Amino acid sequence: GPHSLSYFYTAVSRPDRGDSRFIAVGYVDDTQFVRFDNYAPNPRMEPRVPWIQQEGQDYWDEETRKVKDNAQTYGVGLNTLRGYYNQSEAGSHTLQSMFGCYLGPDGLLLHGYRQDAYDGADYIALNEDLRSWTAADMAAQITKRKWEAANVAERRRSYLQGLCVESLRRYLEMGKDTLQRAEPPKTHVTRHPSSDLGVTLRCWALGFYPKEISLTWQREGQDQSQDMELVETRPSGDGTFQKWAALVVPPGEEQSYTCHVQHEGLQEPLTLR
């Protein structure tokens, strides 16, 4: 699919007065590559993968400056939003932002997005056209109004169409070894004589990249997918992901059941039994 460059900002107000915790994380596709946290003294934007270390000092200095200024911005924003909702200064609140860009086939912006949320719920969002805003309530309409009068959508759109896509292409080039590779899942079926004369078959897919995958159990003689126990896709800890799907069959029907695995790292869908 199309490659992605995404940023996730979390600002958490504290009842202990004035500051707020600010955390920023940056992803290329499903690979985290930078982080920022204002909790530690002398805080810096820091690498989280080897390839981004190819960048020089000036890069890290500029990124650190920008995220620190953004942090102070979100600190002020928490108080502004608290005011809008007529909430007390007693409780802690959160302001989240996700933004980023997808690379099209011509090396240009395919889709760009920017979205802000207050205490877990949609606050304001930039529209597909990248020129207008969707406020989710009346408090956000004040923000929508301010932004509309200051042509904020223009700068957001010029960032997404310009700097974002070019740095995404740059990052795809710096880590082409690992970023442009699809890693297929290592699959296997384990058998557990567990239930009362019922056999649990569990189909495992391990170490696949990117996130998206399809795991189903099919029964010879029926077309739809069979009911199963399916856990959510989970990180392996090394940048890959894993998943499994299990079901219990009578203790004689082991090879009447097939696990089907669909992943973009596989040349063709996979069948295990």
């Binding site: 920008k66 924003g77 301010k146 700097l163």
Partner: peptide
């Protein structure tokens, strides 16, 4: 070159 340089923001 990666984060939006926000200046004139503290503007919600």
């Amino acid at each position: 070159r990666v984060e939006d340089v926000t200046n004139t923001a503290e503007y919600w």
